[PDB]
Design a protein around this ligand. Structure first.
Ligand SMILES: *[C@@H]1O[C@H](C)[C@@H](NC(C)=O)[C@H](O[C@H]2O[C@H](CO)[C@H](O)[C@H](O)[C@H]2O)[C@H]1NC(C)=O
Lengths: 53, 53
């Protein structure tokens, strides 16, 4: 008898595929969301520039 | 003449103060020697708009 050793595999086979993937496509999103933010960084002072002058 | 000029005409400058003006300045009046200058409106956000020096 070994099957419970196979059972535990197929328990490992059914993986979670952690929410630490989709919370980190949401924070990979935070990466390229930031890529949008880093654009905004340029306009921060330029928009400001119009706003002040 | 031995006293401060009341006003522009006496000072010998543009009788209308508003004619004397700046890129961001509204007018310049003589007031018994004291030279008051009024600022324009927008051109800055800042709390100067129409204010006096
Ligand atoms: C210029 O500032 C002097 C101090 C004024 N003179 C006096 C005595 O207050 C002048 O005003 C005299 O001249 C004007 C000329 O039209 C007028 O005749 C007034 O009656 C005077 O007092 C001031 N000049 C002006 C044009 O206000």
């Amino acid at each position: 008898f070994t099957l419970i050793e196979l059972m535990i595999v197929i328990a490992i086979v059914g993986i979670l595929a952690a929410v630490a993937l989709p919370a980190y496509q949401d924070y990979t999103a935070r990466a390229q969301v930031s890529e949008a933010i880093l654009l905004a960084e340029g306009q921060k002072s330029a928009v400001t520039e119009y706003y002040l002058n | 003449h031995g006293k401060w000029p009341e006003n522009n005409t006496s000072a010998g400058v543009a009788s209308s103060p508003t004619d004397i003006k700046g890129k961001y300045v509204k007018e310049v009046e003589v007031k018994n020697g004291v030279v008051t200058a009024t600022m324009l409106s927008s051109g800055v956000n800042n709390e100067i708009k129409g204010k006096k020096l």
